[PDB]
Amino acid sequence: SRPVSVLFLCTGNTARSQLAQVLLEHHGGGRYAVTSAGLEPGSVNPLTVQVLQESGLPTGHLQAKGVRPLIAEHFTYVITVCDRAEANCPIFPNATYRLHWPFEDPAAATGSEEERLAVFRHVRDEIDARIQAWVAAR
């Protein structure tokens, strides 16, 4: 049985959408074909990598990538993980369902590395929870 296609959509594809991609890869297994992309791609935040690796989740395949090369693709679910109020939080044209799971931008948090890592861990855990519940309802 072929997998359900999911695009996690964000601003820079550096944090929330990368966390979501890896967490759905983990909890969903082969049931989902998972992509993440951003409107204005940056670079995966090192704290994104750190908090995933702390959980034993691999990150070597993560790359910040733009949504423009995907504009002709269709996804059964497009799940926007930036707040629509954020600048460069985009919309995607080809989807069956558009879900909006705004999460706090962990990369916007300030303070020491340890204080920022705490925010990244909190957002990781929130995304993890939402993904577990979403997979379980299917």
Automatic annotation (TrEMBL):
GO terms for biological process: response to arsenic-containing substance. Keywords: Arsenical resistance. SUPFAM superfamilies: Phosphotyrosine protein phosphatases I. Residues 4-137 form the Phosphotyrosine protein phosphatase I domain. Gene3D superfamilies: 3.40.50.2300. Pfam families: LMWPc. This is Low molecular weight phosphatase family protein. Disulfide bonds join C82-C89. The keyword Membrane does not apply. SMART domains: LMWPc. CDD domains: LMWP_ArsC (cd16345). Transmembrane segments: none annotated.
